[PDB]
C-alpha cells in the first residue's frame, strides 16, 4: 500500500509511461502476495536497466522474478528469459506476465545447464551466487562471444574482481549514486581466445 508510494519517490530521476507503471503496480501486489527490502530489490533492478547492452537478456535463478521482471517493464525491447529450478517460481512468472501482458520475457523452469541456449545472450544476470567468480563459472555457457555478465554489489567488490578468472575480465564498473545507498554494477566478459 505504501510501498509503492515509496517506490514512486525513490524514481524521483527515472522516466516511467503510465502503462509501465501500471504493470510495476500490479507486480507488486501480486509479489507482496506471494511472500523494505521488497522496495529496495525493485529500485536496483530499475536503475541498472540502462546499462544492459543487447536486446536478449537472461535472469538465471530469478525467483519471483528479480531483477528479472522490473527489467523487462523498463526495457520493452529487449527480451528477457527469466531462468529457475523450481517449477513453483516460474508457475508464479507466467501469472505475471499473464496480469501485466507482459510480452518479452520467457518464464522457463531448468537449471543453468538443462537450459539450451542455444542462441548466446547477450547479457546475463543474476543475483543468486556468492561471489562475481561462482556467478561466472555457472553462468559461462551463455554470453555470446560478445555477451557480459552484470553484477550488482554494494561497495567496490575489490576482493571478488581480484578473485575472478584470468579468462573472464572487468569490462567496465558502473558506479551508482542514487538513493546507505552505494551501488557498483560489475560487467564482465570472457577473455577472448
Not at 528479472?68 to 529457475?84: K, M, N, Q, W
Not at 551466487?129 to 555477451?147: K, R, T
Request: glycine fraction near 6%; include cysteine.
Amino acid at each position: 500500500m505504501l510501498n509503492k508510494l515509496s517506490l514512486l519517490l525513490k524514481d524521483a530521476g527515472i522516466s516511467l509511461t503510465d502503462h509501465q507503471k501500471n504493470q510495476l503496480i500490479a507486480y507488486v501486489n501480486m509479489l507482496h502476495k506471494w511472500n523494505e527490502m521488497l522496495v529496495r530489490h525493485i529500485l536496483d533492478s530499475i536503475v541498472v536497466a540502462p546499462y544492459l547492452q543487447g536486446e536478449r537478456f537472461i535472469d538465471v535463478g530469478t525467483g519471483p522474478g528479480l531483477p528479472g521482471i522490473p527489467l523487462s517493464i523498463v526495457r520493452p525491447e529487449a527480451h528477457f528469459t527469466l531462468l529457475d529450478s523450481l517449477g513453483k517460481r516460474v508457475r508464479f512468472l507466467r501469472q505475471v506476465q499473464h496480469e501485466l501482458k507482459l510480452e518479452n520475457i520467457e518464464p522457463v523452469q531448468s537449471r543453468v545447464e538443462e537450459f539450451p541456449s542455444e542462441p548466446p545472450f547477450d547479457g546475463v544476470i543474476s543475483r543468486a551466487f556468492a561471489s562475481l567468480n561462482d556467478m561466472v563459472s555457472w553462468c559461462h555457457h551463455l554470453p555470446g562471444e560478445q555477451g557480459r555478465f552484470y553484477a550488482l554489489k554494494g561497495q567496490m567488490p575489490e576482493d571478488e574482481i581480484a578473485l575472478l578468472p584470468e579468462e573472464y575480465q572487468v569490462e567496465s564498473v558502473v558506479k551508482l549514486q542514487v538513493p546507505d545507498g552505494e551501488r557498483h554494477l560489475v560487467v564482465i566478459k570472457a577473455n577472448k581466445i
